[PDB]
């Protein structure tokens, strides 16, 4: 297009509208498969960049170049069906390993209608604040105990709390009886 008509914005708008229209006139199962493939691609590129050292820079550069076509999905039901799989894969990515996720969300942000992916990161920040509050509470309780009395080698455990609004957890992944499958200090 740039070769045929020179640099103009209206032709770029025509190109985007054409891609959108081509996407629309497709059967449902095809659209679902397409969304799943897009999400899987993004996840694979990010994971490879994080684990792969020497060619990971090439993968990340290609990812930043390739993000632009995916923005066509904004303003379609494909956005709704694509947010779902992005949620599922990003959950595992965040649990297993970050900072590149925010960078990606800074340019793919508009595509997600219900904005759940950003809500997940907000949840992580809230959990950190909660841990700090918990430490302060422990210190306060120890102070009260010492006041009452005087009025006359360990595993490091960090706890992460998630909201149910914006986090997919299958109820098959739950843990029901802690003492049944855990040591005593951890349970305490």
């Amino acid at each position: 297009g740039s070769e045929l008509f020179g640099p103009r914005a209206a032709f770029m708008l025509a190109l985007r509208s054409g891609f959108s229209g081509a996407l629309l006139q497709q059967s449902f199962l095809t659209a679902a498969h397409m969304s799943e493939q897009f999400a899987r691609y993004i996840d694979q590129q990010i994971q490879g960049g994080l684990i792969g050292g020497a060619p990971g820079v090439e993968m990340l550069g290609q990812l930043q170049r390739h993000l632009e076509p995916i923005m066509v999905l904004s303003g379609l039901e494909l956005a709704t069906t694509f947010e779902h799989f992005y949620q599922h894969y990003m959950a595992d990515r965040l649990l297993s390993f970050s900072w590149l996720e925010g960078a990606v969300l800074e340019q793919i942000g508009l595509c997600f209608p219900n904005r759940l992916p950003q809500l997940m990161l907000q949840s992580l920040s809230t959990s950190e604040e909660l841990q700090r509050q918990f430490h302060l509470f422990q210190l306060q309780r120890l102070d009260k105990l010492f006041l009452e009395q005087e009025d006359e080698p360990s595993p490091a455990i960090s706890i992460l709390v998630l909201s149910p609004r914006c986090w997919p957890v299958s109820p098959l992944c739950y843990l029901y009886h802690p003492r049944k499958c855990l040591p005593t200090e951890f349970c305490d």
Partner: peptide
């Protein structure tokens, strides 16, 4: 035995 050096637990709220 096997010694733990750090653990990260995950919970939801209902």
């Amino acid at each position: 035995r096997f010694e733990v050096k750090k653990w990260n637990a995950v919970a939801l709220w209902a």
